[PDB]
JSON list of C-alpha atoms in Angstrom, two decimals:
[
{"chain": "A", "resi": 1, "resn": "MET", "atom": "CA", "xyz": [-2.98, 19.88, 8.55]},
{"chain": "A", "resi": 2, "resn": "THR", "atom": "CA", "xyz": [-1.15, 18.82, 11.71]},
{"chain": "A", "resi": 3, "resn": "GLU", "atom": "CA", "xyz": [-2.08, 15.69, 13.65]},
{"chain": "A", "resi": 4, "resn": "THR", "atom": "CA", "xyz": [-3.72, 16.36, 17.03]},
{"chain": "A", "resi": 5, "resn": "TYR", "atom": "CA", "xyz": [-3.54, 12.76, 18.32]},
{"chain": "A", "resi": 6, "resn": "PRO", "atom": "CA", "xyz": [-0.49, 10.64, 19.16]},
{"chain": "A", "resi": 7, "resn": "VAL", "atom": "CA", "xyz": [0.37, 7.50, 17.23]},
{"chain": "A", "resi": 8, "resn": "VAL", "atom": "CA", "xyz": [-1.50, 4.47, 18.55]},
{"chain": "A", "resi": 9, "resn": "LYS", "atom": "CA", "xyz": [0.65, 1.67, 19.98]},
{"chain": "A", "resi": 10, "resn": "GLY", "atom": "CA", "xyz": [1.46, -0.69, 17.14]},
{"chain": "A", "resi": 11, "resn": "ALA", "atom": "CA", "xyz": [0.96, 1.89, 14.35]},
{"chain": "A", "resi": 12, "resn": "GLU", "atom": "CA", "xyz": [4.53, 3.21, 14.38]},
{"chain": "A", "resi": 13, "resn": "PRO", "atom": "CA", "xyz": [6.44, 3.41, 11.08]},
{"chain": "A", "resi": 14, "resn": "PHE", "atom": "CA", "xyz": [9.48, 1.20, 10.68]},
{"chain": "A", "resi": 15, "resn": "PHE", "atom": "CA", "xyz": [12.98, 2.33, 9.65]},
{"chain": "A", "resi": 16, "resn": "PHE", "atom": "CA", "xyz": [15.15, -0.82, 9.51]},
{"chain": "A", "resi": 17, "resn": "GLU", "atom": "CA", "xyz": [18.83, -0.17, 8.69]},
{"chain": "A", "resi": 18, "resn": "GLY", "atom": "CA", "xyz": [20.26, -2.85, 6.41]},
{"chain": "A", "resi": 19, "resn": "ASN", "atom": "CA", "xyz": [22.37, -3.10, 3.26]},
{"chain": "A", "resi": 20, "resn": "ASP", "atom": "CA", "xyz": [22.61, -0.92, 0.12]},
{"chain": "A", "resi": 21, "resn": "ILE", "atom": "CA", "xyz": [19.25, -2.20, -1.25]},
{"chain": "A", "resi": 22, "resn": "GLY", "atom": "CA", "xyz": [16.07, -0.51, 0.03]},
{"chain": "A", "resi": 23, "resn": "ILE", "atom": "CA", "xyz": [12.45, -1.72, 0.19]},
{"chain": "A", "resi": 24, "resn": "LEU", "atom": "CA", "xyz": [9.69, 0.88, 0.59]},
{"chain": "A", "resi": 25, "resn": "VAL", "atom": "CA", "xyz": [6.62, -0.80, 2.18]},
{"chain": "A", "resi": 26, "resn": "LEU", "atom": "CA", "xyz": [3.31, 1.12, 1.95]},
{"chain": "A", "resi": 27, "resn": "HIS", "atom": "CA", "xyz": [0.06, 0.74, 3.91]},
{"chain": "A", "resi": 28, "resn": "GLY", "atom": "CA", "xyz": [-3.46, 1.64, 2.80]},
{"chain": "A", "resi": 29, "resn": "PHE", "atom": "CA", "xyz": [-6.43, 3.96, 3.34]},
{"chain": "A", "resi": 30, "resn": "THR", "atom": "CA", "xyz": [-7.59, 4.12, 7.02]},
{"chain": "A", "resi": 31, "resn": "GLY", "atom": "CA", "xyz": [-4.83, 1.57, 7.74]},
{"chain": "A", "resi": 32, "resn": "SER", "atom": "CA", "xyz": [-1.38, 1.83, 9.32]},
{"chain": "A", "resi": 33, "resn": "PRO", "atom": "CA", "xyz": [2.12, 0.28, 9.19]},
{"chain": "A", "resi": 34, "resn": "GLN", "atom": "CA", "xyz": [0.82, -2.49, 11.50]},
{"chain": "A", "resi": 35, "resn": "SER", "atom": "CA", "xyz": [-0.62, -4.31, 8.47]},
{"chain": "A", "resi": 36, "resn": "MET", "atom": "CA", "xyz": [2.81, -4.14, 6.75]},
{"chain": "A", "resi": 37, "resn": "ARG", "atom": "CA", "xyz": [5.24, -4.71, 9.64]},
{"chain": "A", "resi": 38, "resn": "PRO", "atom": "CA", "xyz": [5.42, -8.55, 9.30]},
{"chain": "A", "resi": 39, "resn": "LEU", "atom": "CA", "xyz": [6.54, -8.04, 5.68]},
{"chain": "A", "resi": 40, "resn": "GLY", "atom": "CA", "xyz": [9.05, -5.35, 6.70]},
{"chain": "A", "resi": 41, "resn": "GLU", "atom": "CA", "xyz": [10.55, -7.56, 9.40]},
{"chain": "A", "resi": 42, "resn": "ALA", "atom": "CA", "xyz": [10.94, -10.44, 6.95]},
{"chain": "A", "resi": 43, "resn": "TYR", "atom": "CA", "xyz": [12.60, -8.24, 4.33]},
{"chain": "A", "resi": 44, "resn": "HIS", "atom": "CA", "xyz": [14.98, -6.75, 6.91]},
{"chain": "A", "resi": 45, "resn": "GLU", "atom": "CA", "xyz": [15.89, -10.26, 8.10]},
{"chain": "A", "resi": 46, "resn": "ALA", "atom": "CA", "xyz": [16.95, -10.98, 4.50]},
{"chain": "A", "resi": 47, "resn": "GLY", "atom": "CA", "xyz": [19.40, -8.06, 4.87]},
{"chain": "A", "resi": 48, "resn": "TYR", "atom": "CA", "xyz": [17.57, -5.20, 3.14]},
{"chain": "A", "resi": 49, "resn": "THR", "atom": "CA", "xyz": [17.14, -1.66, 4.37]},
{"chain": "A", "resi": 50, "resn": "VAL", "atom": "CA", "xyz": [13.38, -1.26, 4.86]},
{"chain": "A", "resi": 51, "resn": "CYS", "atom": "CA", "xyz": [11.17, 1.81, 5.25]},
{"chain": "A", "resi": 52, "resn": "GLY", "atom": "CA", "xyz": [7.50, 1.42, 6.21]},
{"chain": "A", "resi": 53, "resn": "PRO", "atom": "CA", "xyz": [6.21, 4.98, 6.49]},
{"chain": "A", "resi": 54, "resn": "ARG", "atom": "CA", "xyz": [3.06, 6.10, 8.28]},
{"chain": "A", "resi": 55, "resn": "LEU", "atom": "CA", "xyz": [0.71, 7.99, 5.97]},
{"chain": "A", "resi": 56, "resn": "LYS", "atom": "CA", "xyz": [-0.20, 11.41, 7.37]},
{"chain": "A", "resi": 57, "resn": "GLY", "atom": "CA", "xyz": [-3.35, 11.25, 9.47]},
{"chain": "A", "resi": 58, "resn": "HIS", "atom": "CA", "xyz": [-3.14, 7.45, 9.76]},
{"chain": "A", "resi": 59, "resn": "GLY", "atom": "CA", "xyz": [-2.42, 5.51, 12.94]},
{"chain": "A", "resi": 60, "resn": "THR", "atom": "CA", "xyz": [-3.61, 8.40, 15.13]},
{"chain": "A", "resi": 61, "resn": "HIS", "atom": "CA", "xyz": [-7.34, 9.23, 14.94]},
{"chain": "A", "resi": 62, "resn": "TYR", "atom": "CA", "xyz": [-9.86, 9.29, 12.11]},
{"chain": "A", "resi": 63, "resn": "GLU", "atom": "CA", "xyz": [-10.45, 12.98, 12.86]},
{"chain": "A", "resi": 64, "resn": "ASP", "atom": "CA", "xyz": [-6.82, 13.54, 11.85]},
{"chain": "A", "resi": 65, "resn": "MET", "atom": "CA", "xyz": [-7.32, 11.52, 8.67]},
{"chain": "A", "resi": 66, "resn": "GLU", "atom": "CA", "xyz": [-10.43, 13.55, 7.81]},
{"chain": "A", "resi": 67, "resn": "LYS", "atom": "CA", "xyz": [-8.20, 16.64, 7.47]},
{"chain": "A", "resi": 68, "resn": "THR", "atom": "CA", "xyz": [-5.56, 15.08, 5.17]},
{"chain": "A", "resi": 69, "resn": "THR", "atom": "CA", "xyz": [-5.21, 15.21, 1.39]},
{"chain": "A", "resi": 70, "resn": "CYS", "atom": "CA", "xyz": [-3.95, 12.79, -1.19]},
{"chain": "A", "resi": 71, "resn": "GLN", "atom": "CA", "xyz": [-0.90, 15.08, -1.59]},
{"chain": "A", "resi": 72, "resn": "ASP", "atom": "CA", "xyz": [-0.22, 14.59, 2.16]},
{"chain": "A", "resi": 73, "resn": "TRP", "atom": "CA", "xyz": [-0.18, 10.83, 1.59]},
{"chain": "A", "resi": 74, "resn": "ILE", "atom": "CA", "xyz": [2.07, 11.18, -1.45]},
{"chain": "A", "resi": 75, "resn": "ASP", "atom": "CA", "xyz": [4.37, 13.37, 0.69]},
{"chain": "A", "resi": 76, "resn": "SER", "atom": "CA", "xyz": [4.62, 10.68, 3.39]},
{"chain": "A", "resi": 77, "resn": "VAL", "atom": "CA", "xyz": [5.56, 8.13, 0.74]},
{"chain": "A", "resi": 78, "resn": "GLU", "atom": "CA", "xyz": [8.10, 10.41, -0.96]},
{"chain": "A", "resi": 79, "resn": "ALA", "atom": "CA", "xyz": [9.73, 11.17, 2.41]},
{"chain": "A", "resi": 80, "resn": "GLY", "atom": "CA", "xyz": [10.18, 7.44, 3.07]},
{"chain": "A", "resi": 81, "resn": "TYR", "atom": "CA", "xyz": [11.61, 7.08, -0.45]},
{"chain": "A", "resi": 82, "resn": "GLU", "atom": "CA", "xyz": [14.08, 9.94, 0.24]},
{"chain": "A", "resi": 83, "resn": "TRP", "atom": "CA", "xyz": [15.17, 8.29, 3.50]},
{"chain": "A", "resi": 84, "resn": "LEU", "atom": "CA", "xyz": [15.97, 5.13, 1.53]},
{"chain": "A", "resi": 85, "resn": "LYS", "atom": "CA", "xyz": [17.75, 7.07, -1.22]},
{"chain": "A", "resi": 86, "resn": "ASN", "atom": "CA", "xyz": [20.02, 8.63, 1.42]},
{"chain": "A", "resi": 87, "resn": "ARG", "atom": "CA", "xyz": [21.41, 5.18, 2.25]},
{"chain": "A", "resi": 88, "resn": "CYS", "atom": "CA", "xyz": [20.58, 2.85, -0.68]},
{"chain": "A", "resi": 89, "resn": "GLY", "atom": "CA", "xyz": [21.51, 2.71, -4.35]},
{"chain": "A", "resi": 90, "resn": "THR", "atom": "CA", "xyz": [18.76, 0.30, -5.46]},
{"chain": "A", "resi": 91, "resn": "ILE", "atom": "CA", "xyz": [15.12, 0.70, -4.38]},
{"chain": "A", "resi": 92, "resn": "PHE", "atom": "CA", "xyz": [12.00, -1.50, -4.67]},
{"chain": "A", "resi": 93, "resn": "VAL", "atom": "CA", "xyz": [8.45, -0.54, -3.63]},
{"chain": "A", "resi": 94, "resn": "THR", "atom": "CA", "xyz": [5.61, -2.74, -2.37]},
{"chain": "A", "resi": 95, "resn": "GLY", "atom": "CA", "xyz": [2.28, -1.85, -0.82]},
{"chain": "A", "resi": 96, "resn": "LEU", "atom": "CA", "xyz": [-1.23, -2.98, 0.11]},
{"chain": "A", "resi": 97, "resn": "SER", "atom": "CA", "xyz": [-4.45, -1.57, -1.37]},
{"chain": "A", "resi": 98, "resn": "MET", "atom": "CA", "xyz": [-4.02, 2.22, -1.57]},
{"chain": "A", "resi": 99, "resn": "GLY", "atom": "CA", "xyz": [-0.39, 1.50, -0.64]},
{"chain": "A", "resi": 100, "resn": "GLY", "atom": "CA", "xyz": [-0.36, -0.54, -3.82]},
{"chain": "A", "resi": 101, "resn": "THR", "atom": "CA", "xyz": [-1.88, 2.44, -5.62]},
{"chain": "A", "resi": 102, "resn": "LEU", "atom": "CA", "xyz": [0.96, 4.52, -4.17]},
{"chain": "A", "resi": 103, "resn": "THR", "atom": "CA", "xyz": [3.42, 1.83, -5.26]},
{"chain": "A", "resi": 104, "resn": "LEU", "atom": "CA", "xyz": [2.21, 2.31, -8.83]},
{"chain": "A", "resi": 105, "resn": "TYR", "atom": "CA", "xyz": [2.34, 6.09, -8.35]},
{"chain": "A", "resi": 106, "resn": "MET", "atom": "CA", "xyz": [6.02, 5.87, -7.42]},
{"chain": "A", "resi": 107, "resn": "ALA", "atom": "CA", "xyz": [6.87, 3.72, -10.43]},
{"chain": "A", "resi": 108, "resn": "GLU", "atom": "CA", "xyz": [5.00, 6.22, -12.60]},
{"chain": "A", "resi": 109, "resn": "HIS", "atom": "CA", "xyz": [7.08, 9.14, -11.33]},
{"chain": "A", "resi": 110, "resn": "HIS", "atom": "CA", "xyz": [10.50, 7.61, -10.54]},
{"chain": "A", "resi": 111, "resn": "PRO", "atom": "CA", "xyz": [12.15, 5.66, -13.39]},
{"chain": "A", "resi": 112, "resn": "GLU", "atom": "CA", "xyz": [15.03, 4.78, -11.06]},
{"chain": "A", "resi": 113, "resn": "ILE", "atom": "CA", "xyz": [12.87, 2.32, -9.10]},
{"chain": "A", "resi": 114, "resn": "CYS", "atom": "CA", "xyz": [14.03, -1.20, -9.91]},
{"chain": "A", "resi": 115, "resn": "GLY", "atom": "CA", "xyz": [10.81, -3.15, -9.31]},
{"chain": "A", "resi": 116, "resn": "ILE", "atom": "CA", "xyz": [7.40, -3.08, -7.64]},
{"chain": "A", "resi": 117, "resn": "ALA", "atom": "CA", "xyz": [5.11, -5.52, -5.83]},
{"chain": "A", "resi": 118, "resn": "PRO", "atom": "CA", "xyz": [1.57, -4.10, -5.47]},
{"chain": "A", "resi": 119, "resn": "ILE", "atom": "CA", "xyz": [-0.82, -6.20, -3.37]},
{"chain": "A", "resi": 120, "resn": "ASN", "atom": "CA", "xyz": [-4.57, -5.78, -3.99]},
{"chain": "A", "resi": 121, "resn": "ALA", "atom": "CA", "xyz": [-3.79, -2.36, -5.49]},
{"chain": "A", "resi": 122, "resn": "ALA", "atom": "CA", "xyz": [-6.79, -0.07, -6.15]},
{"chain": "A", "resi": 123, "resn": "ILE", "atom": "CA", "xyz": [-7.54, 1.87, -9.33]},
{"chain": "A", "resi": 124, "resn": "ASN", "atom": "CA", "xyz": [-11.37, 1.60, -9.12]},
{"chain": "A", "resi": 125, "resn": "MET", "atom": "CA", "xyz": [-13.45, 1.19, -5.94]},
{"chain": "A", "resi": 126, "resn": "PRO", "atom": "CA", "xyz": [-17.14, 1.48, -6.94]},
{"chain": "A", "resi": 127, "resn": "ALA", "atom": "CA", "xyz": [-18.40, 0.94, -3.38]},
{"chain": "A", "resi": 128, "resn": "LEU", "atom": "CA", "xyz": [-16.11, 3.64, -1.96]},
{"chain": "A", "resi": 129, "resn": "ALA", "atom": "CA", "xyz": [-15.67, 6.27, -4.68]},
{"chain": "A", "resi": 130, "resn": "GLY", "atom": "CA", "xyz": [-19.24, 5.58, -5.77]},
{"chain": "A", "resi": 131, "resn": "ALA", "atom": "CA", "xyz": [-20.49, 6.74, -2.37]},
{"chain": "A", "resi": 132, "resn": "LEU", "atom": "CA", "xyz": [-20.01, 10.28, -3.73]},
{"chain": "A", "resi": 133, "resn": "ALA", "atom": "CA", "xyz": [-22.39, 9.69, -6.70]},
{"chain": "A", "resi": 134, "resn": "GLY", "atom": "CA", "xyz": [-25.71, 9.86, -4.84]},
{"chain": "A", "resi": 135, "resn": "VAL", "atom": "CA", "xyz": [-28.06, 12.81, -4.51]},
{"chain": "A", "resi": 136, "resn": "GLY", "atom": "CA", "xyz": [-28.26, 14.41, -1.09]},
{"chain": "A", "resi": 137, "resn": "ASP", "atom": "CA", "xyz": [-25.69, 14.81, 1.69]},
{"chain": "A", "resi": 138, "resn": "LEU", "atom": "CA", "xyz": [-23.86, 11.69, 2.87]},
{"chain": "A", "resi": 139, "resn": "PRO", "atom": "CA", "xyz": [-23.14, 11.24, 6.59]},
{"chain": "A", "resi": 140, "resn": "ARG", "atom": "CA", "xyz": [-19.79, 12.40, 7.90]},
{"chain": "A", "resi": 141, "resn": "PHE", "atom": "CA", "xyz": [-18.45, 8.83, 8.30]},
{"chain": "A", "resi": 142, "resn": "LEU", "atom": "CA", "xyz": [-19.04, 5.46, 6.66]},
{"chain": "A", "resi": 143, "resn": "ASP", "atom": "CA", "xyz": [-18.46, 2.05, 8.22]},
{"chain": "A", "resi": 144, "resn": "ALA", "atom": "CA", "xyz": [-14.89, 0.83, 8.69]},
{"chain": "A", "resi": 145, "resn": "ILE", "atom": "CA", "xyz": [-13.33, -0.95, 5.70]},
{"chain": "A", "resi": 146, "resn": "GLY", "atom": "CA", "xyz": [-10.56, -2.67, 7.69]},
{"chain": "A", "resi": 147, "resn": "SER", "atom": "CA", "xyz": [-9.98, -6.29, 8.72]},
{"chain": "A", "resi": 148, "resn": "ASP", "atom": "CA", "xyz": [-11.27, -8.01, 5.58]},
{"chain": "A", "resi": 149, "resn": "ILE", "atom": "CA", "xyz": [-9.29, -11.11, 6.54]},
{"chain": "A", "resi": 150, "resn": "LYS", "atom": "CA", "xyz": [-10.08, -14.78, 5.93]},
{"chain": "A", "resi": 151, "resn": "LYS", "atom": "CA", "xyz": [-7.99, -16.20, 8.79]},
{"chain": "A", "resi": 152, "resn": "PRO", "atom": "CA", "xyz": [-10.20, -16.06, 11.90]},
{"chain": "A", "resi": 153, "resn": "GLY", "atom": "CA", "xyz": [-9.25, -13.96, 14.88]},
{"chain": "A", "resi": 154, "resn": "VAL", "atom": "CA", "xyz": [-7.00, -11.38, 13.16]},
{"chain": "A", "resi": 155, "resn": "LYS", "atom": "CA", "xyz": [-7.77, -7.67, 13.68]},
{"chain": "A", "resi": 156, "resn": "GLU", "atom": "CA", "xyz": [-6.16, -5.06, 11.46]},
{"chain": "A", "resi": 157, "resn": "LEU", "atom": "CA", "xyz": [-5.00, -1.91, 13.23]},
{"chain": "A", "resi": 158, "resn": "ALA", "atom": "CA", "xyz": [-7.15, 0.41, 11.09]},
{"chain": "A", "resi": 159, "resn": "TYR", "atom": "CA", "xyz": [-9.75, 3.08, 11.88]},
{"chain": "A", "resi": 160, "resn": "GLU", "atom": "CA", "xyz": [-13.26, 2.13, 13.01]},
{"chain": "A", "resi": 161, "resn": "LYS", "atom": "CA", "xyz": [-14.82, 4.85, 10.79]},
{"chain": "A", "resi": 162, "resn": "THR", "atom": "CA", "xyz": [-14.17, 5.97, 7.21]},
{"chain": "A", "resi": 163, "resn": "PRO", "atom": "CA", "xyz": [-14.21, 9.78, 6.72]},
{"chain": "A", "resi": 164, "resn": "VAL", "atom": "CA", "xyz": [-16.35, 10.70, 3.73]},
{"chain": "A", "resi": 165, "resn": "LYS", "atom": "CA", "xyz": [-14.17, 13.80, 3.27]},
{"chain": "A", "resi": 166, "resn": "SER", "atom": "CA", "xyz": [-11.18, 11.46, 2.60]},
{"chain": "A", "resi": 167, "resn": "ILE", "atom": "CA", "xyz": [-13.05, 9.57, -0.14]},
{"chain": "A", "resi": 168, "resn": "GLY", "atom": "CA", "xyz": [-12.56, 12.40, -2.63]},
{"chain": "A", "resi": 169, "resn": "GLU", "atom": "CA", "xyz": [-8.82, 12.22, -1.87]},
{"chain": "A", "resi": 170, "resn": "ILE", "atom": "CA", "xyz": [-8.42, 8.52, -2.61]},
{"chain": "A", "resi": 171, "resn": "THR", "atom": "CA", "xyz": [-10.63, 8.98, -5.70]},
{"chain": "A", "resi": 172, "resn": "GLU", "atom": "CA", "xyz": [-8.31, 11.71, -7.02]},
{"chain": "A", "resi": 173, "resn": "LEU", "atom": "CA", "xyz": [-5.32, 9.46, -6.36]},
{"chain": "A", "resi": 174, "resn": "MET", "atom": "CA", "xyz": [-6.83, 6.44, -8.13]},
{"chain": "A", "resi": 175, "resn": "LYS", "atom": "CA", "xyz": [-7.86, 8.50, -11.18]},
{"chain": "A", "resi": 176, "resn": "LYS", "atom": "CA", "xyz": [-4.33, 9.92, -11.52]},
{"chain": "A", "resi": 177, "resn": "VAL", "atom": "CA", "xyz": [-2.53, 6.58, -11.11]},
{"chain": "A", "resi": 178, "resn": "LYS", "atom": "CA", "xyz": [-4.95, 4.73, -13.40]},
{"chain": "A", "resi": 179, "resn": "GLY", "atom": "CA", "xyz": [-4.43, 7.38, -16.07]},
{"chain": "A", "resi": 180, "resn": "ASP", "atom": "CA", "xyz": [-0.64, 7.05, -15.82]},
{"chain": "A", "resi": 181, "resn": "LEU", "atom": "CA", "xyz": [-0.31, 3.23, -15.77]},
{"chain": "A", "resi": 182, "resn": "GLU", "atom": "CA", "xyz": [1.56, 3.22, -19.12]},
{"chain": "A", "resi": 183, "resn": "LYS", "atom": "CA", "xyz": [4.50, 4.91, -17.34]},
{"chain": "A", "resi": 184, "resn": "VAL", "atom": "CA", "xyz": [5.04, 1.83, -15.17]},
{"chain": "A", "resi": 185, "resn": "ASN", "atom": "CA", "xyz": [8.30, 0.44, -16.53]},
{"chain": "A", "resi": 186, "resn": "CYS", "atom": "CA", "xyz": [9.98, -1.73, -14.20]},
{"chain": "A", "resi": 187, "resn": "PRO", "atom": "CA", "xyz": [9.62, -5.34, -13.26]},
{"chain": "A", "resi": 188, "resn": "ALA", "atom": "CA", "xyz": [6.28, -5.90, -11.56]},
{"chain": "A", "resi": 189, "resn": "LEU", "atom": "CA", "xyz": [5.05, -8.69, -9.27]},
{"chain": "A", "resi": 190, "resn": "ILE", "atom": "CA", "xyz": [1.31, -8.06, -8.85]},
{"chain": "A", "resi": 191, "resn": "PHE", "atom": "CA", "xyz": [-0.44, -9.92, -6.01]},
{"chain": "A", "resi": 192, "resn": "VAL", "atom": "CA", "xyz": [-4.22, -10.16, -5.93]},
{"chain": "A", "resi": 193, "resn": "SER", "atom": "CA", "xyz": [-6.60, -12.01, -3.66]},
{"chain": "A", "resi": 194, "resn": "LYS", "atom": "CA", "xyz": [-8.99, -14.36, -5.39]},
{"chain": "A", "resi": 195, "resn": "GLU", "atom": "CA", "xyz": [-11.73, -13.06, -3.10]},
{"chain": "A", "resi": 196, "resn": "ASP", "atom": "CA", "xyz": [-11.38, -9.48, -1.96]},
{"chain": "A", "resi": 197, "resn": "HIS", "atom": "CA", "xyz": [-14.37, -7.72, -0.38]},
{"chain": "A", "resi": 198, "resn": "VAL", "atom": "CA", "xyz": [-12.78, -4.24, -0.48]},
{"chain": "A", "resi": 199, "resn": "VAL", "atom": "CA", "xyz": [-10.91, -3.81, -3.77]},
{"chain": "A", "resi": 200, "resn": "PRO", "atom": "CA", "xyz": [-12.39, -5.69, -6.79]},
{"chain": "A", "resi": 201, "resn": "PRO", "atom": "CA", "xyz": [-9.81, -8.29, -7.88]},
{"chain": "A", "resi": 202, "resn": "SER", "atom": "CA", "xyz": [-10.27, -7.19, -11.51]},
{"chain": "A", "resi": 203, "resn": "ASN", "atom": "CA", "xyz": [-8.27, -4.06, -10.54]},
{"chain": "A", "resi": 204, "resn": "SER", "atom": "CA", "xyz": [-5.09, -6.11, -10.52]},
{"chain": "A", "resi": 205, "resn": "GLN", "atom": "CA", "xyz": [-5.88, -7.69, -13.88]},
{"chain": "A", "resi": 206, "resn": "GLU", "atom": "CA", "xyz": [-6.38, -4.25, -15.40]},
{"chain": "A", "resi": 207, "resn": "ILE", "atom": "CA", "xyz": [-3.14, -3.07, -13.80]},
{"chain": "A", "resi": 208, "resn": "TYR", "atom": "CA", "xyz": [-1.33, -6.08, -15.21]},
{"chain": "A", "resi": 209, "resn": "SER", "atom": "CA", "xyz": [-2.66, -5.40, -18.70]},
{"chain": "A", "resi": 210, "resn": "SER", "atom": "CA", "xyz": [-2.07, -1.64, -18.71]},
{"chain": "A", "resi": 211, "resn": "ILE", "atom": "CA", "xyz": [1.50, -1.29, -17.41]},
{"chain": "A", "resi": 212, "resn": "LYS", "atom": "CA", "xyz": [4.38, -1.44, -19.91]},
{"chain": "A", "resi": 213, "resn": "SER", "atom": "CA", "xyz": [6.82, -3.57, -17.88]},
{"chain": "A", "resi": 214, "resn": "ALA", "atom": "CA", "xyz": [8.78, -6.10, -19.92]},
{"chain": "A", "resi": 215, "resn": "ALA", "atom": "CA", "xyz": [8.81, -8.43, -16.87]},
{"chain": "A", "resi": 216, "resn": "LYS", "atom": "CA", "xyz": [5.45, -8.76, -15.12]},
{"chain": "A", "resi": 217, "resn": "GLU", "atom": "CA", "xyz": [3.59, -11.46, -13.20]},
{"chain": "A", "resi": 218, "resn": "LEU", "atom": "CA", "xyz": [0.11, -11.77, -11.70]},
{"chain": "A", "resi": 219, "resn": "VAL", "atom": "CA", "xyz": [-0.05, -14.04, -8.62]},
{"chain": "A", "resi": 220, "resn": "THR", "atom": "CA", "xyz": [-3.48, -14.94, -7.23]},
{"chain": "A", "resi": 221, "resn": "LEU", "atom": "CA", "xyz": [-3.77, -15.68, -3.50]},
{"chain": "A", "resi": 222, "resn": "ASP", "atom": "CA", "xyz": [-6.35, -18.42, -2.92]},
{"chain": "A", "resi": 223, "resn": "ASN", "atom": "CA", "xyz": [-6.68, -18.32, 0.89]},
{"chain": "A", "resi": 224, "resn": "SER", "atom": "CA", "xyz": [-6.86, -14.61, 1.73]},
{"chain": "A", "resi": 225, "resn": "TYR", "atom": "CA", "xyz": [-9.24, -11.70, 1.54]},
{"chain": "A", "resi": 226, "resn": "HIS", "atom": "CA", "xyz": [-8.22, -8.04, 1.19]},
{"chain": "A", "resi": 227, "resn": "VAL", "atom": "CA", "xyz": [-5.67, -7.62, 3.98]},
{"chain": "A", "resi": 228, "resn": "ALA", "atom": "CA", "xyz": [-3.52, -10.43, 2.62]},
{"chain": "A", "resi": 229, "resn": "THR", "atom": "CA", "xyz": [-0.40, -9.20, 4.42]},
{"chain": "A", "resi": 230, "resn": "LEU", "atom": "CA", "xyz": [-2.01, -10.34, 7.71]},
{"chain": "A", "resi": 231, "resn": "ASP", "atom": "CA", "xyz": [-3.89, -13.32, 6.24]},
{"chain": "A", "resi": 232, "resn": "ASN", "atom": "CA", "xyz": [-3.29, -17.01, 5.41]},
{"chain": "A", "resi": 233, "resn": "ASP", "atom": "CA", "xyz": [-1.10, -16.22, 2.40]},
{"chain": "A", "resi": 234, "resn": "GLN", "atom": "CA", "xyz": [1.28, -13.81, 4.17]},
{"chain": "A", "resi": 235, "resn": "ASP", "atom": "CA", "xyz": [4.01, -16.44, 3.75]},
{"chain": "A", "resi": 236, "resn": "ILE", "atom": "CA", "xyz": [3.49, -16.61, -0.01]},
{"chain": "A", "resi": 237, "resn": "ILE", "atom": "CA", "xyz": [3.68, -12.82, -0.35]},
{"chain": "A", "resi": 238, "resn": "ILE", "atom": "CA", "xyz": [6.95, -12.74, 1.61]},
{"chain": "A", "resi": 239, "resn": "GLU", "atom": "CA", "xyz": [8.61, -15.69, -0.14]},
{"chain": "A", "resi": 240, "resn": "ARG", "atom": "CA", "xyz": [7.64, -14.72, -3.67]},
{"chain": "A", "resi": 241, "resn": "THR", "atom": "CA", "xyz": [8.62, -11.08, -3.11]},
{"chain": "A", "resi": 242, "resn": "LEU", "atom": "CA", "xyz": [12.04, -12.18, -1.83]},
{"chain": "A", "resi": 243, "resn": "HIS", "atom": "CA", "xyz": [12.55, -14.44, -4.86]},
{"chain": "A", "resi": 244, "resn": "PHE", "atom": "CA", "xyz": [11.44, -11.61, -7.16]},
{"chain": "A", "resi": 245, "resn": "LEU", "atom": "CA", "xyz": [13.82, -9.13, -5.52]},
{"chain": "A", "resi": 246, "resn": "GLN", "atom": "CA", "xyz": [16.72, -11.57, -5.80]},
{"chain": "A", "resi": 247, "resn": "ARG", "atom": "CA", "xyz": [15.92, -12.37, -9.42]},
{"chain": "A", "resi": 248, "resn": "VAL", "atom": "CA", "xyz": [15.85, -8.67, -10.38]},
{"chain": "A", "resi": 249, "resn": "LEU", "atom": "CA", "xyz": [19.11, -8.06, -8.49]},
{"chain": "A", "resi": 250, "resn": "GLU", "atom": "CA", "xyz": [20.89, -11.08, -10.06]},
{"chain": "A", "resi": 251, "resn": "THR", "atom": "CA", "xyz": [19.54, -10.80, -13.57]}
]
């Protein structure tokens, strides 16, 4: 497909030029780089090169998203990874929700990646994927999934409708990544919200148990819902990721 609508103000990807170490920062389904930009800014301020790509069909219009495929989203991620590889020798990946799914995807396919930090990553979404299990035609769109945030007054820049056509795409992605979790190698810092109304927190426990990383941690966020990167525990995500990155680099 090709996008028909321009990028909404605030949904632009970020390409921050820094040192020889690159962080790939991935947003989720119906979302945009706006949910990830505070993290990207913090990581760039620590000196890193940072790429926060915009998934195809995201940050424009949900009619654009309706036309995209899970391979389109993989392609957006891989292109951000290639931009980093052009200027960095060491690369880490982090991402929220389906961006966390894509974080795991990258570790499953790229043994060169030095560590990952998935945040509320999704391998099973019974409310979303399960929408396809009923008899009889579903409507074209479901309700928005965005802005599951505990801190009052915070709005995620995400679409106001969920295209049912896109649900099969995220389902295919989750099946593939779940099936390949044993290929995840590398140091892993897995963040999960205690209460998450979008991605069941047990996802992250299963991810933790299924990957083969010799260095892995599960950190539970006690004051955030799903979009933790914009929520009360944003500071914990940033600080602990920076410590993790430094520890992998030093050790």
